[PDB]
């Protein structure tokens, strides 16, 4: 599985969804997750994300390991997203700010 990590939050560019062959992204108000059982590890999304938030599971930084289970969890309850949309209004302001997990919206 690939995993969406901290820098997506309050950015949510949604460039990633457009390359995904299997449509395994699920949508929150200010974040995206990947469903780990649906992901085929094609790795195409990783270079697409402007926030560089996406990692191979086996490459998620130690300080962001909690994102692995959180993707799995929220992918069970959020709606599928399969089309690019406009990034969130102040995405530029939040790209690169750390510890945005505190801002995550259910
Ligand atoms: S690795 Fe491939 S299958 Fe998995 S989320 Fe990214 S684009 Fe979709
Ligand atoms: S910011 Fe989030 S919505 Fe996709 S392009 Fe990056 S994982």
From Swiss-Prot:
Is the keyword Lipoprotein in the record? Answer: no
> Which residue range or ranges hold the 4Fe-4S ferredoxin-type domain?
1-29, 30-59
Q: Cite the entry's keywords alphabetically.
A: 3Fe-4S, 4Fe-4S, DNA-binding, Electron transport, Iron, Iron-sulfur, Metal-binding, Repeat, Transport
**What molecular function terms (GO) are annotated for this protein?**
3 iron, 4 sulfur cluster binding; 4 iron, 4 sulfur cluster binding; DNA binding; electron transfer activity; metal ion binding
Q: Which organism is it from?
A: Azotobacter vinelandii
Lineage, top ranks? Bacteria, Pseudomonadati, Pseudomonadota, Gammaproteobacteria, Pseudomonadales
Q: What does this protein do?
A: Ferredoxins are iron-sulfur proteins that transfer electrons in a wide variety of metabolic reactions. This ferredoxin could play a role in regulating gene expression by interacting directly with DNA.
Name of the gene: fdxA
What cofactors does the UniProt entry give for this protein?
[4Fe-4S] cluster; [3Fe-4S] cluster
> Would I find 4Fe-4S among this entry's keywords?
yes
Residue sites binding [4Fe-4S] cluster per the record: 20, 39, 42, 45
Question: What is the protein name given in its UniProt record?
Answer: Ferredoxin-1
């Amino acid at each position: 599985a690939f995993v969406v990590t901290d820098n997506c939050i309050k950015c949510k560019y949604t460039d990633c969804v457009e390359v995904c062959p299997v449509d395994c992204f699920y949508e929150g108000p200010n974040f995206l997750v990947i469903h780990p059982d649906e992901c085929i590890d094609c790795a195409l999304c990783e270079p697409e994300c402007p926030a560089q938030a996406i990692f191979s599971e086996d490459e998620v930084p130690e300080d962001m390991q909690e994102f692995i289970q959180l993707n799995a969890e929220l992918a069970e309850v959020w709606p599928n997203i399969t089309e690019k949309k406009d990034p969130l209004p102040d995405a530029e302001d939040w790209d690169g700010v750390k510890g945005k997990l505190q801002h995550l919206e259910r």
